[PDB]
C-alpha cells in the first residue's frame, strides 16, 4: 500500500527520514555486496 | 497634495488626510521620502506598505502622494544602465552621492535629465498630421548600436500641434505637443508606464523564428524562438553563466535585459563586474554589449518590494524595446528568489498561505508574467515586429522539481535547458543534460527549417533518437558488457559518443567555436548522421553474408574519416567562411562515401 | 494560522466595540 | 486584442500614416495607379478632417476601418517607400515603381518576403555609412553601396538579379569583416572590381572626388610594399587617374609584382 | 544636533506583557528610544515598538515588572537607536546593547551610526578575492574563505561550534604570504559559554583585534535583536571607514531567530512557517548582506554565521534561509564529534562557493585548489571503501583500497584533527595535505595536473 | 462554436463568472433552442485558483490546501448545469478540463471534481513520455453512465463484459510489471507473461490512436477482443460463458 | 562541562580522561558496526571489529547498566566507576594489541581464541559491577580491580 501508516507529526517526519536513510544505506551496502558477488561470479565463470 | 502619517508599525504606515489616494498608488512617506505602496484604504485614511526601513518616521510626517502606481520611466538613457527593481539608478546613486550605500529614501531621477541627446524628428510628421498611440515621431541616436525610437505613449493620440526640429534635447524638453478634442498634451522624450499593466500590441503572433545562442546543443536539439519562453535550473557548478553570456554576446536579440530579482550579494557583484566587460562584434568593430543591455540588478537585502517588482520592471523595459521593434531577450536570474520575495510580501500582508507556504496566486502571477512574452506586431503606425524572449531561471531545492515555483514554471514555460552540474564535473561544456531538457517549439520551427535548412529536421529526430537509444544501451552494457552488443548497436554507441564529444560539447573559450552558426551546426550533424546511416547500412547489408562488417573493421578502415568528423569542430566561421565550411563538410562527405564504398 | 487570524480579527472588532 | 477606442484610434492613425507615406513617395501625384488603389483611404487626408471627425467615421464604419487590411495596404506602401528612400539619389522610373508596387501587392506576406529582407540588408549598408568616417573599408562600402543603389534603381528588388545578389553577398560580408583587417578589406574590394563585368564600374555613379580618393587609396596600399624608387614613381604616376578601372588595377598589380621580383 | 529638551510622560495608559502604552505623546517617532523610570527609582530602556496618533507602544528592554500607570515616568530620547563607534572598541567586551562589561569606560564615540545601516549599493560591491585564513585546516585547505564571503558553520546543539568559533577568533588573520579586526557577537549564549569566550580571548593575546559583544541567554531578547546590528555597524565602521579587513563571527543565529520570533509575537503578528515570521528572510538578509568588499575602500567585512540547526533538520527555516543568503556551509558533525575528532568539520557536505577566489598563486599558493580537490576525492573514495570493507571483508580488499583506507584514517587523524590551540597557516595545511596525498603513487592523484604533481609531490 | 476567452493576463476575478456565462449560453441553446451543446471549460484549475484568490481576500473558512470551504458547492453549481431535461430535446454535455497540480489526484480540485462529475478521463504522464497518444490511462478513468449507455440495442451486447475484462487484464498486467521490477523475468510464470503481452498490445493497439483517427465503438470492441483472445478462456474470469462462446472464437 | 572538569580529573583521577575518550570511541564504532551487522551479517568482521563489538557489549551491559534498587549499585562512587572503566578499556587495549601484533602472520590470534582462553577474565569484568562500597572498603575494591588487571595481564601474556 502507498503509505507506511504512521500518523502525521514532526516526530513521524523525523522517524520517516531516519528510516528512508536506513533503507538507502541498506540499498548501498547490498548493492556493494551484489557487486562483490558479481565480480567473483564473473571471475569464476572466466576461470 | 500632502497627507500626514497617522501611525507606524514596522513597514505598515497609516496615513490620514489621503481622501483621494488611489489604491496601489505610490507615496513618499516622511521627510526622507521613503517609498510606500497604498495597500488599503478606509474612510479618508490609507495603509501604506513602506518599502524602506521605517525607523525614524513620526506621526505628522508629510506623505507626498505620487500620482502613479509602481511605474517605470521609459526613455533614452536606459541602455547601459543598472537599476534596482524600483527603477532606482544605482550607477547614478553611487556617482552622485559618492557613497557605498543606497541613501534611505533616495530620490534620484531614473533617467538623467542633465545629459543631452540627439533627436531627429520623423521627417513626414508636421503640424496638423494625425498621430496615434505607438507612432514613432522621431529617433534618438542613443548609441552606435541602438537607435532609440521615441514613441507616443499608448492611450495617447491626436493631431500634431508642435514637433521639435532636429537637434539636441533632454528628457525635460517638451519635444512634441498634440491635440485631441481640443484638449492638449505635451510629450517629452520620457514616458511612464505602470510595471503591472501589459503594454498593448496591435497583434500578438506565433513565435516563429529561432533564438540563436551559438551553442550547438541549444540551437539544434532544444530551440527557443524569438518571443518564446525558457527555463534554466540555476545551481553552483552548473554554469548558467554560459547561457546568459551566450544570449548577451551572440544571440540575435537586438536588445538584452537582465533581472537579478534578489541574488546573493557577491553573486550579483559578479554579474555587475562581468557584463560591462563582455563585447560583441558589430559591423567589424568590437563593441561593449552594455550598449545594448540594461540590468535590473539587486541583492537580497534590498527592499522586498524591490525584489518582487524586479521581474515586472524588467519585462516592462523589454516591452518598451519590443514596441520599438527590437527583439528583446530578458533573462531573470532567479524566479525562485522573486517567488520568495512574493511569499515574504504575502506573509507581511498576512494572506492565507497556499501550497507549501507560497501565496494563493503564485501560479497566476507566473503565468501572466511569462505570458507577457511573445512576438508581436507592435502598436502604432510604422509597421514593426518586436519580441521579448523570457529566459528566466528557476532554482529547485537540490534538483527537486516539485516545489510550486519550479513546477509552475515548468508548466508555463515552453523550453527548458536543464543545465547539469554533473556534466560540468565530467568537463562537458555546455552542461545541458539533453535528457531532462526539452523544447516544445519544434513544431512551430519546422516551418522555418523547411525554408532555410531543409535537411535539419530529420537530423534532429535521428540525433535525439540515437541519444535515447544509448540511454538503454548503457544498461545493456552494465548487464552483459560492451562485447555483448550486436555490431549495429556498437555503432550506435560509438556514434553517440562522437555526438557527445564533438557535437554537443563546445568549449566556449576557443576562437573557432565559441559561436557556432546554424549552417555549421546542421552541417556537422548532417555529416555525423550520414556516417551513422552508412555504418548501419554496412553492418545490415552484410549480416546476410560471411563478409559481415564490424565496428572494428569500420574504425580501422576509416580512422581518417573519424578523425576528420571529430575535428569538424575546428572549422572557424570567422576565417573559414560559410562557403568554405560547407565545401569542407561536403568533401568530408565525399571521402566518407568513397571509404564506405571501398569497404563495400 | 486561520484560527489565529480569526482571533486577531475578533480582537480588532472588540476594540471597535469598546471605543 | 486592443480596446475598442484604441482600435479606432489605430485606424485613424494608419489612415494618416498611409496618406503621409503616399505624399512622401510621390509628392506630385505621379503614381496615379497607386493613388487610385489607395483612393478610399487617401480621401480622408485629402480633405481636412480633424482626428475626431475621422475617428467618428471609423466608429461608424464610414471610412475603411478593417485594421488588418489597413496594415497590409500600409505595409505594401511602406516597403515601396523604403525602396525609394534606400536608393536615395538614384531616382527610379514611375513604371518600375508601379511594377514593384504590383509585385509587393501580389506577395503573400511582405514581412517574410525576400523583398523585405533585401530592403533590410540595403538599409544595413546605408545606415552604417550614414555615420562611418572615411577609411579604406568605409570607402569600399560606400562605393559598392552606390553601385548597388544604382542597380536597385535600375532593376527593382523584386527579381533574382545575379548582379544585385552578388553586390549584397559581398557588401554584407565586407561590412561584417573586422576593421583592422585592411589587407582582406582590400582583397575583397579589388576582387569585386576584378570580377565585375564592367571595366569601370563606378564611373558616373560616384563623384569624381570619391573616385580620385579611391585611386589614391589603392595606390597608398600598393606603394609601401615596393622596393625600387623608379618603380615607386612609376606607380605614383597612376595616381593621376580620375576613374578606377580594372585595367588600371592590372597595371598596379604588374608593378607591385615587378618590385617583388626585384626583391 | 538635537537642541530641544526631552519630554517625559507620566501618561502610561497600559502595560501589556513587555509593552508599555503611553498616550498623549507629542509627535511620537517610531523606533524612538525611551528611558523610563519605575516608581521605585529603577530605570529601564525601551524602544517605541509602534505608533498611532497620540499613542506610543514602548517595548521595555527589561520586563515590565514593577511598572504602573500614575507613577512610572517615561522620557522620550527624541531619536532612533544609535551606536557610538570608534577604533577604541577594538579590544573591548560589551553586552548586548553597547554597555561595556569589561569594567572599562563607556565608549568615546568617533561617530554615532544608525544600527540599521543601509544596504551596500550592489553596483559598488566588489567580488571578494583574497583569502582569510582561520588556522583551522579543515576549512582553510578545503573550504577557504574569500575576503567578503559569508559562510555559516552549521552545527547541532551540543557540538563544539562555540569552541570552533573561539578558535577562529583567536587564530584568524591575513595570509601574510596588520590591518585585520574581528567582531565577535554571541547571541543567546549561556553564561558559561560567554565566560568561556571572554576569558579565552583575554588569555590568548587576541583581544587586541577582537571586539566582543555578548547577549547572555537571560538578557533581554530585544538586546538580542539589536546585538547583530551593533556588531555589523562596528564592522562597517572598521571596514569601510578605517579600511581594515573585518571578520564578523555571529554566534547562534538560531538564538537570534528565537528573539525575532519573540518580538514578532509581541507585535502580535501571526506566525509564518514553522512558527517564524514571514519576513525572516529579509531580516536575516539585512544582517548577512552587510558584508563584502566595496569599490574604492581597501577594507571589507567577512561573516561567519553560526547556526544551531534544530533537530539536525537542514530544511528548517533558519538553515534554509541562511543557505539562500550565504555562500557556503561548514558542517560540524555529530559522528565525528562522538568519535572525539576536533574540529569535527565534516568536509564532504561542507562547501565554500567562493573558495575559487581565495586560492591560487599570489593568494595562498600554486597548488591549493588541486590539493583541495584531490583530498576531497580521496576522502570520499576512502569513505566509500570503509563502507564496503565491512561487507566484503578486509582480505577481499585490493591494495589500492587499502591505500584509500589508510588515507581516510590519516586524513581524519592528522588533517581534520587539530586540537583547539594549534594554529596552522594555510601553507602548513597544504603541506599536511601533501603528506597525506603521498600515500598514493602519483598515478592515483588523477585530479592534480602533472605540472603540479611534478613540482610538489617529491620529498 | 461560441468562445469565451479569459487569457492568462486578463482579470482573475472574471474567471469566476466566465464558466457561468458559458453555461448560461449553453442552457439558452439547449433548453430553449434545443441544440445539443457540448461545453468545454478549460483549466478549471485556473478557475479554482481564482476562487481561492477571492475567498482568501474574504478570509472565508479554508478547506484542504487553502481552497475555500464551499468549493464543492461552487464547482457543483458549475458542473451540475448539465444533462437533459424532460420534454426538451437538447442537452448539455460537459467536458471540463483541469490541470491536476503536481499530477496529484488527491488535490482538492481533481478530488472535488471527482465527487461532483460523472467520471473522469485521466491523462497520464507515464504514457505521454512514451509518446502514446492519447495518453488516457484507463485504470483510474471512470464514466458513471457507461453502465446504462451500453448494452443490448445500444452499441453491442458484449460491451460491458469486454470493458470489464480489459480493466481486469490491464490491472493484472500492471501488477505483473510491478512484480517483475522486483523478481526479474526469470521468476514470472507463463500467465504473468501472458498478462504482460496483453498490457503491451493493449497500450499499442487499444489506447494508441491517431490524432485524426475516428474508431467506431464496434471497431474498438473488436480490437478489445483481439486482446482478450491473448488469454485462454478460463483466464477471462469476468466474462460469462454465454458471451464467451459467441464472441471469443471468431 | 568536560572542558572544565578535565582539570579536576588531571588532579584527582589523572587516568580518567583517555578512558572516557576511548569508551566513547568504542561505543560509536559499535554503533557503526551494528548497522552493517544487521544489513549483511557478522561473517565479514575482522578481529578488531569483533573485539570492538564484544567489548562494546561488555560496556553496555556491565558498565553503562546499573540496577538502582540493589544495595551495591544504588550509588557508584567515582573510584569504582573509574576502576571499572579502566579495567574494561585495558581489556580492549590488550585484545587489540594481541590481534594487531599477530595479524598478517601464521600464529594468528583471534577473538575466537581469546574468549575461550580467558572466559574467567570476561566473567570477572562483567562481575565488577557487583562490588559493594557499603560493606567492601574503597581499599578492597581498588585492590580487587587491580588484581583483575593483574589476572588480565597474566592471561594475555600466556596467550602470547
- Give the separation between CA E164 and CA E152, rounded to whole angstroms: 12
User: Contacts for E381-384 with beta carbons within 8 Å, 24 or more apart?
Assistant: E382/E407, E382/E408, E382/E411, E383/E348, E383/E408
- Give the separation between CA F226 and CA F229, rounded to whole angstroms: 5
- E116 CB neighbours in chain B (<8 A) are 53, 55
Among residues E305, D138, E392, D52, the alpha carbon closest in space to that of G40 is found at E392
Chains G and A touch (3+ CB pairs under 8 A): yes
Chains B and D touch (3+ CB pairs under 8 A): yes
- Give the separation between CA B107 and CA B101, rounded to whole angstroms: 14
Q: Where are the beta strands (DSSP E) in B391-432?
A: 415-416
Q: Which residues contact B520 (CB under 8 A, 6 or more apart)?
A: B571, B573, B581
Among residues B591, B561, B587, B435, the alpha carbon closest in space to that of B504 is found at B435
Chain F contact probe: residue of C2, C4, C5, C13 with most F CBs at under 10 A: C2
- Give the separation between CA B277 and CA B289, rounded to whole angstroms: 8
For E30, the closest of B55, B269, B304 (CB atoms) is: B55
- Give the separation between CA E302 and CA E248, rounded to whole angstroms: 6
- DSSP string for B234-295: --TTT-HHHHHHHHHHHSS-SEEEEE-SSB-HHHHHHHHHHGGG-EEEETTEEEEGGGSEEE
- Give the separation between CA B215 and CA B430, rounded to whole angstroms: 8
- Give the separation between CA B567 and CA B403, rounded to whole angstroms: 43
Buried b / exposed e over E54-74, threshold 16 CB at 10 Å, is ebbbbbbbbebeebeeeebeb
Q: What is the 3-state secondary structure of B309-345? A: HHHHHHHHHHHHHHHHCCEEEEEECCHHHHHHHHHHH
Helix or strand holding residue B204 (H, E): strand B203-205
* A33/E311 touch (CB, cutoff 8 Å), yes or no: no
Buried b / exposed e over E269-300, threshold 16 CB at 10 Å, is bbebbbebbbbbbbbbbbbbbbbbbbeeeebb
- Give the separation between CA E103 and CA E198, rounded to whole angstroms: 13
* E391/A29 touch (CB, cutoff 8 Å), yes or no: yes
- Give the separation between CA D56 and CA G22, rounded to whole angstroms: 97
Q: What backbone phi and psi angles, to 5 degrees, belong to E115?
A: -70, -20
- E397 at A interface, C-beta within 8 A: no
Place of cell 482478450: F228
**A40 C-beta neighbours (distance < 10 Å), count:** 12
As given in the structure block, the three cell numbers for residue E457 are 609531490
Q: In the Cβ-directed half-sphere of E39, how many Cα atoms lie within 13 Å?
A: 9
The answer to whether D128 touches D141, Cβ cutoff 8 Å, is yes
Chain C nearest C-alpha distance from E352 (Å): 37
Residues of F comprising the binding site for ATP? 144
Q: Interior CA angle at F194 toward F189 and F196, to 5°?
A: 95
The helix/strand/coil state of B62 is: strand
* D24/B124 touch (CB, cutoff 8 Å), yes or no: yes
Q: What is the 3-state secondary structure of chain E? A: CCCCCCEEECCEEEEECCEEEECCCCCCECCEEEEEECCCCCEEEEEEEEEECCEEEEEECCCCCCCCCCCCEEEEEEEECEEEECCCCCCEEEECCCCECCCCCCCCCCEEEECCCCCECCCCEECCCCEEECCCHHHHCCCCEECCCECCEEECCCCCHHHHHHHHHHHCEECCCCCEEEEEEEEEECHHHHHHHHHHHHHCCHHHCEEEEEEECCCCHHHHHHHHHHHHHHHHHHHHCCCCEEEEEEECHHHHHHHHHHHHHHHCCCCCHHHCCCCHHHHHHHHHCCCCEECCECCCEEECCEEECHHHCCCCHHHHHHHHHCCEEEEECHHHHHCCCCCCEEEEEEEECCHHHHCCCCCCCCCHHHHHHHHHHHHHHHHHHHHHHHHHCHHHCCHHHHHHHHHHHHHHHHHCCCCCCCCCCHHHHHHHHHHHHCCCCHHHCCCCCHHHHHHHCCC
Q: Which residues contact E388 (CB under 8 A, 6 or more apart)?
A: A32, A36, E397, E401
User: How many folded domains does chain E comprise?
Assistant: 1
Place of cell 528610544: E33
- Residue F187's Cβ-count burial label (10 Å; 0-12, 13-18, 19+) is exposed
Chain C contact probe: residue of B350, B354, B357, B358 with most C CBs at under 10 A: B350
For chain F, breaks with the C atom over 2.5 A from the next N come after: none
Q: Which residues contact F116 (CB under 8 A, 6 or more apart)?
A: F72, F75, F76, F79, F80
Chain C residues interacting with chain B (CB cutoff of 8 angstroms): 1-2, 5
Beta bridge partners of B174: B188
Q: What backbone phi and psi angles, to 5 degrees, belong to F42?
A: -90, 125
Among residues B364, B234, E178, E135, the alpha carbon closest in space to that of F14 is found at B364
- C15 CB neighbours in chain E (<8 A) are none
- Residue E437's Cβ-count burial label (10 Å; 0-12, 13-18, 19+) is buried
Does the bond joining B430 to the residue before it have cis omega, within 30 degrees of 0? yes
Question: Determined by which method?
Answer: cryo-EM
As given in the structure block, the three cell numbers for residue G91 are 581489556
The answer to whether B347 touches B12, Cβ cutoff 8 Å, is no
- Give the separation between CA B277 and CA E297, rounded to whole angstroms: 22
The answer to whether B135 touches D10, Cβ cutoff 8 Å, is no
Q: What backbone phi and psi angles, to 5 degrees, belong to F54?
A: -65, -45
The answer to whether B176 touches B187, Cβ cutoff 8 Å, is yes
Domain limits at E198? 1-459
- B452 at E interface, C-beta within 8 A: no
- B347 at E interface, C-beta within 8 A: yes
User: Contacts for B136-139 with beta carbons within 8 Å, 24 or more apart?
Assistant: B136/B324, B136/B380, B136/B381, B136/B382, B137/B163, B137/B175, B137/B176, B138/B163, B138/B164, B138/B175, B138/B176
* E267/B10 touch (CB, cutoff 8 Å), yes or no: yes
- G40 at A interface, C-beta within 8 A: yes
- Give the separation between CA D123 and CA D137, rounded to whole angstroms: 17
Beta bridge partners of B229: B390
Which residue is closest to B276 within chain E, CA to CA? E123
* F61/C2 touch (CB, cutoff 8 Å), yes or no: yes
- Give the separation between CA G89 and CA G23, rounded to whole angstroms: 7
- Give the separation between CA B125 and CA F92, rounded to whole angstroms: 57
- B181 CB neighbours in chain D (<8 A) are 52
Bridge pairing between strands E73-80 and E145-146? unpaired
CATH number, domain containing residue E156: 3.40.50.12240
Confirm whether residue G119 is marked as ligand binding. no
The helix/strand/coil state of B142 is: coil
Among residues E368, E348, E375, the alpha carbon closest in space to that of E438 is found at E375
Among residues E167, E134, E137, the alpha carbon closest in space to that of E151 is found at E134
* C9/F61 touch (CB, cutoff 8 Å), yes or no: no
The answer to whether G39 touches A29, Cβ cutoff 8 Å, is yes
The answer to whether G115 touches G126, Cβ cutoff 8 Å, is no
Q: Which of residues 369-428 of B touch E (CB under 8 A)?
A: none
- A26 CB neighbours in chain G (<8 A) are 39
As given in the structure block, the three cell numbers for residue E31 are 523606533
Chain A contact probe: residue of E334, E384, E388 with most A CBs at under 10 A: E388
Bridge pairing between strands B385-390 and B136-140? unpaired
Q: What is the side-by-side order of every strand in the sheet holding E131-133?
A: E145-146, E131-133, E173-174
Answer positive or negative: Cα dihedral of E202, E206, E211, E214: negative
As given in the structure block, the three cell numbers for residue E154 are 552549521
- Give the separation between CA F94 and CA F40, rounded to whole angstroms: 6
Which residue is closest to B354 within chain C, CA to CA? C1
Which residue is closest to E163 within chain G, CA to CA? G3
Count helices and strands (H / E) in chain A: 1, 0
- B185 CB neighbours in chain D (<8 A) are none
Residues of E comprising the binding site for ATP? 353
Among residues B303, B322, B311, the alpha carbon closest in space to that of B207 is found at B322
Chain B contact probe: residue of E282, E289, E290, E295 with most B CBs at under 10 A: E282
* F101/B371 touch (CB, cutoff 8 Å), yes or no: no
The answer to whether B133 touches D10, Cβ cutoff 8 Å, is yes
* E279/B7 touch (CB, cutoff 8 Å), yes or no: no
- C4 at E interface, C-beta within 8 A: yes
Among residues F218, F210, F248, the alpha carbon closest in space to that of F231 is found at F248
As given in the structure block, the three cell numbers for residue A19 are 528510516
Among residues F44, F105, F48, the alpha carbon closest in space to that of F71 is found at F48
Place of cell 584509500: E404
The answer to whether B226 touches B211, Cβ cutoff 8 Å, is yes
The answer to whether E363 touches E130, Cβ cutoff 8 Å, is yes
DSSP category for residue B149: E
Place of cell 522586498: B304
- Residue B395 region by backbone torsions, left for phi larger than 0, else alpha for psi between -120 and 50, else beta: beta
- B43 at C interface, C-beta within 8 A: no
For B600, D231, D245, the CA distances from D258, given in Å and listed in that order, are: 54, 8, 20
Amino acid at each position: 500500500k502507498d503509505r507506511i501508516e504512521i500518523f502525521p507529526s514532526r516526530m513521524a517526519q523525523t522517524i520517516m527520514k531516519a528510516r528512508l536513510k536506513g533503507a538507502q544505506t541498506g540499498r548501498n551496502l547490498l548493492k556493494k555486496k551484489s557487486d562483490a558477488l558479481t565480480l567473483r561470479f564473473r571471475q569464476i565463470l572466466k576461470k | 497634495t500632502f497627507g500626514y502619517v497617522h501611525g507606524v508599525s514596522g513597514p505598515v504606515v497609516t496615513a490620514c488626510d489621503m481622501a483621494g489616494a488611489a489604491m496601489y498608488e505610490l507615496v513618499r512617506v516622511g521627510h526622507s521620502e521613503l517609498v510606500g505602496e497604498i495597500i488599503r484604504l478606509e474612510g479618508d485614511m490609507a495603509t501604506i506598505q513602506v518599502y524602506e526601513e521605517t525607523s525614524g518616521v513620526s506621526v505628522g510626517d508629510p506623505v507626498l502622494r505620487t500620482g502613479k502606481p509602481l511605474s517605470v520611466e521609459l526613455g533614452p538613457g536606459i541602455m547601459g544602465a543598472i537599476f534596482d527593481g524600483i527603477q532606482r539608478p544605482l550607477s547614478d546613486i553611487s556617482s552622485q552621492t559618492q557613497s557605498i550605500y543606497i541613501p534611505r529614501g533616495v530620490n534620484v531621477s531614473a533617467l538623467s535629465r542633465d545629459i543631452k541627446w540627439e533627436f531627429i524628428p520623423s521627417k513626414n510628421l508636421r503640424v496638423g498630421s494625425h498621430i496615434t498611440g505607438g507612432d514613432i515621431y522621431g529617433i534618438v541616436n542613443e548609441n552606435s548600436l541602438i537607435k532609440h525610437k521615441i514613441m507616443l505613449p499608448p492611450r495617447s493620440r491626436g493631431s500634431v500641434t508642435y514637433i521639435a526640429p532636429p537637434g539636441n534635447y533632454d528628457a525635460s524638453d517638451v519635444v512634441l505637443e498634440l491635440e485631441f478634442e481640443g484638449v492638449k498634451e505635451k510629450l517629452s522624450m520620457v514616458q511612464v508606464w505602470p510595471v503591472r499593466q501589459v503594454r498593448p500590441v496591435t497583434e500578438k503572433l506565433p513565435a516563429n523564428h529561432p533564438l540563436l545562442t551559438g551553442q550547438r546543443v541549444l540551437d539544434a536539439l532544444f530551440p527557443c524562438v524569438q518571443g518564446g519562453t525558457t527555463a534554466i535550473p540555476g545551481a553552483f557548478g552548473c554554469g548558467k553563466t554560459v547561457i546568459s553570456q551566450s544570449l548577451s554576446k551572440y544571440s540575435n536579440s537586438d536588445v538584452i535585459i537582465y533581472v537579478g530579482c534578489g541574488e546573493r550579494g557577491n553573486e550579483m557583484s559578479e554579474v555587475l563586474r562581468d557584463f560591462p566587460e563582455l563585447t560583441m562584434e558589430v559591423d567589424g568593430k568590437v563593441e561593449s554589449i552594455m550598449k545594448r543591455t540594461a540590468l535590473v540588478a539587486n541583492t537580497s537585502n534590498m527592499p522586498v518590494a524591490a525584489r518582487e517588482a524586479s521581474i515586472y520592471t524588467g519585462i516592462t523595459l523589454s516591452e518598451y524595446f519590443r514596441d520599438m521593434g527590437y527583439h528583446v531577450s530578458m533573462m531573470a536570474d532567479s524566479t525562485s528568489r522573486w517567488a520568495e520575495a512574493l511569499r515574504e510580501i504575502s506573509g507581511r500582508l498576512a494572506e492565507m498561505p497556499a501550497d507549501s507556504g507560497y501565496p494563493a496566486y503564485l501560479g497566476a502571477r507566473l503565468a501572466s508574467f511569462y505570458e507577457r512574452a511573445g512576438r508581436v506586431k507592435c502598436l502604432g503606425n510604422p509597421e514593426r515586429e518586436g519580441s521579448v524572449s523570457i529566459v528566466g531561471a528557476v532554482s529547485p531545492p537540490g534538483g527537486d522539481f516539485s516545489d510550486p515555483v519550479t513546477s509552475a514554471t515548468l508548466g508555463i514555460v515552453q523550453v527548458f535547458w536543464g543545465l547539469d552540474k554533473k556534466l560540468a564535473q565530467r568537463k562537458h561544456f555546455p552542461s545541458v543534460n539533453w535528457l531532462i531538457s526539452y523544447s516544445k517549439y519544434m513544431r512551430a520551427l519546422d516551418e522555418y527549417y523547411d525554408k532555410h535548412f531543409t535537411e535539419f529536421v530529420p537530423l534532429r529526430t535521428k540525433a535525439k533518437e540515437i541519444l535515447q537509444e544509448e540511454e538503454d544501451l548503457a544498461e545493456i552494457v552494465q548487464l552483459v558488457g560492451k562485447a555483448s552488443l550486436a555490431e549495429t548497436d556498437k555503432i550506435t554507441l560509438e556514434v553517440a559518443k562522437l555526438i557527445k564529444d564533438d557535437f554537443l560539447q563546445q568549449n566556449g573559450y576557443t576562437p573557432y567555436d565559441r559561436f557556432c552558426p546554424f549552417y555549421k551546426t546542421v552541417g556537422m550533424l548532417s555529416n555525423m548522421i550520414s556516417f551513422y546511416d552508412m555504418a548501419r547500412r554496412a553492418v545490415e547489408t552484410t549480416a546476410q553474408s560471411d563478409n559481415k562488417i564490424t565496428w572494428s573493421i569500420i574504425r580501422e578502415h576509416m580512422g581518417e574519416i573519424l578523425y576528420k568528423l571529430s575535428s569538424m569542430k575546428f572549422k572557424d566561421p570567422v576565417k573559414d567562411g560559410e562557403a568554405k565550411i560547407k565545401a569542407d563538410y561536403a568533401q568530408l562527405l565525399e571521402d566518407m562515401q568513397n571509404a564506405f564504398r571501398s569497404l563495400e | 494560522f486561520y484560527r489565529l487570524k480569526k482571533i486577531q480579527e475578533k480582537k480588532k472588532i472588540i476594540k471597535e466595540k469598546s471605543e | 486584442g486592443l480596446t475598442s477606442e484604441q482600435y479606432h484610434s489605430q485606424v485613424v492613425g494608419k489612415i494618416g500614416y498611409i496618406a503621409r507615406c503616399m505624399q512622401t513617395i510621390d509628392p506630385e501625384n505621379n503614381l496615379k495607379k497607386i493613388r487610385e488603389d489607395y483612393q478610399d483611404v487617401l480621401i480622408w487626408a485629402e480633405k481636412n478632417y480633424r482626428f475626431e471627425e475621422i475617428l467618428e467615421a471609423s466608429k461608424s464604419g464610414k471610412c475603411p476601418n478593417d485594421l488588418d487590411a489597413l496594415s497590409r495596404r500600409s505595409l505594401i506602401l511602406q516597403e515601396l517607400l523604403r525602396l525609394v528612400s534606400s536608393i536615395s539619389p538614384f531616382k527610379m522610373k514611375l513604371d518600375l515603381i508601379e511594377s514593384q508596387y504590383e509585385k509587393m501587392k501580389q506577395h503573400v506576406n511582405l514581412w517574410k518576403s525576400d523583398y523585405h529582407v533585401k530592403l533590410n540588408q540595403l538599409n544595413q549598408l546605408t545606415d552604417y555609412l550614414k555615420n562611418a568616417a572615411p577609411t579604406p573599408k568605409n570607402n569600399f562600402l560606400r562605393a559598392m553601396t552606390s553601385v548597388l543603389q544604382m542597380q536597385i534603381a535600375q532593376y527593382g528588388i523584386t527579381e533574382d538579379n545575379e548582379g544585385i545578389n552578388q553586390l549584397f553577398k559581398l557588401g554584407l560580408h565586407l561590412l561584417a569583416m573586422a576593421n583592422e583587417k585592411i589587407d582582406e578589406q582590400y582583397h575583397l574590394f579589388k576582387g569585386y572590381v576584378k570580377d565585375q563585368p564592367e571595366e569601370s564600374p563606378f564611373e558616373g555613379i560616384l563623384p569624381a572626388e570619391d573616385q580620385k580618393i579611391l585611386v589614391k587609396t589603392m595606390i597608398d596600399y600598393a606603394m609601401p610594399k615596393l622596393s625600387s624608387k623608379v618603380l615607386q614613381d612609376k606607380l605614383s604616376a597612376l595616381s593621376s587617374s580620375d576613374v578606377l578601372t580594372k585595367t588600371l588595377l592590372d597595371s598596379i598589380d604588374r608593378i607591385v609584382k615587378e618590385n617583388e621580383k626585384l626583391n | 544636533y538635537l537642541s530641544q529638551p526631552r519630554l517625559t510622560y507620566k501618561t502610561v495608559s497600559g502595560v501589556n506583557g513587555p509593552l508599555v502604552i503611553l498616550d498623549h505623546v507629542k509627535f511620537p517617532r517610531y523606533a524612538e528610544i525611551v528611558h523610563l523610570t519605575l516608581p521605585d527609582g529603577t530605570k529601564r530602556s525601551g524602544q517605541v515598538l509602534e505608533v498611532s496618533g497620540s499613542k506610543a507602544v514602548v517595548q521595555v528592554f527589561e520586563g515590565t515588572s514593577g511598572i504602573d500607570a500614575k507613577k512610572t515616568s517615561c522620557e522620550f530620547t527624541g531619536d532612533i537607536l544609535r551606536t557610538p563607534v570608534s577604533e577604541d572598541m577594538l579590544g573591548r567586551v560589551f553586552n548586548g546593547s553597547g554597555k561595556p562589561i569589561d569594567r572599562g569606560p563607556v565608549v568615546l564615540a568617533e561617530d554615532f551610526l544608525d544600527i540599521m545601516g543601509q544596504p551596500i549599493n550592489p553596483q559598488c560591491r566588489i567580488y571578494p578575492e583574497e583569502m582569510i585564513q582561520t588556522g583551522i585546516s579543515a576549512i582553510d585547505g578545503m573550504n577557504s574563505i574569500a575576503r567578503g564571503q559569508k559562510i555559516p558553520i552549521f552545527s547541532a546543539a551540543g557540538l563544539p561550534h562555540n569552541e570552533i568559533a573561539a578558535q577562529i577568533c583567536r587564530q584568524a588573520g591575513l595570509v601574510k604570504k596588520e590591518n585585520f579586526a574581528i567582531v565577535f557577537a554571541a547571541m543567546g549564549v549561556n553564561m558559561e559559554t560567554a565566560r568561556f569566550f571572554k576569558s579565552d580571548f583575554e588569555e590568548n593575546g587576541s583581544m587586541d583585534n577582537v571586539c566582543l559583544f555578548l547577549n547572555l541567554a537571560n538578557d533581554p531578547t530585544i538586546e538580542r535583536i539589536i546585538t547583530p546590528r551593533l556588531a555589523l555597524t562596528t564592522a562597517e565602521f572598521l571596514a569601510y571607514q578605517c579600511e581594515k579587513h573585518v571578520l564578523v563571527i555571529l554566534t547562534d543565529m538560531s538564538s537570534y531567530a528565537e528573539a525575532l520570533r519573540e518580538v514578532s509575537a509581541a507585535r502580535e503578528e501571526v506566525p509564518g512557517r514553522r512558527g517564524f515570521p514571514g519576513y525572516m528572510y529579509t531580516d536575516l538578509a539585512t544582517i548577512y548582506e552587510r558584508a563584502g568588499r566595496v569599490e574604492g575602500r581597501n577594507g571589507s567585512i567577512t561573516q561567519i554565521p553560526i547556526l544551531t540547526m534544530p533537530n539536525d533538520d537542514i530544511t528548517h527555516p533558519i538553515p534554509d534561509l541562511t543557505g539562500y543568503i550565504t555562500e557556503g556551509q561548514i558542517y560540524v558533525d555529530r559522528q565525528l564529534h562522538n568519535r572525539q575528532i576536533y574540529p569535527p568539520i565534516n568536509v564532504l557536505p561542507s562547501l565554500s562557493r567562493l573558495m575559487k577566489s581565495a586560492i591560487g598563486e599570489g593568494m595562498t599558493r600554486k597548488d591549493h585548489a588541486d590539493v583541495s580537490n584531490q583530498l576531497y576525492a580521496c576522502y570520499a573514495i576512502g569513505k566509500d571503501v570503509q563502507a564496503m570493507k565491512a561487507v566484503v571483508g578486509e582480505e577481499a580488499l585490493t591494495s589500492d583500497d587499502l591505500l584509500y583506507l589508510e588515507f581516510l584514517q590519516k586524513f581524519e587523524k592528522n588533517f581534520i584533527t587539530q586540537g583547539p590551540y594549534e594554529n596552522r597557516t594555510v601553507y602548513e595545511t597544504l603541506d599536511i595535505g601533501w603528506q597525506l596525498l603521498r600515500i598514493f603513487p602519483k598515478e592515483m592523484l588523477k585530479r592534480i595536473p602533472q605540472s603540479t604533481l611534478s613540482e610538489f609531490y617529491p620529498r
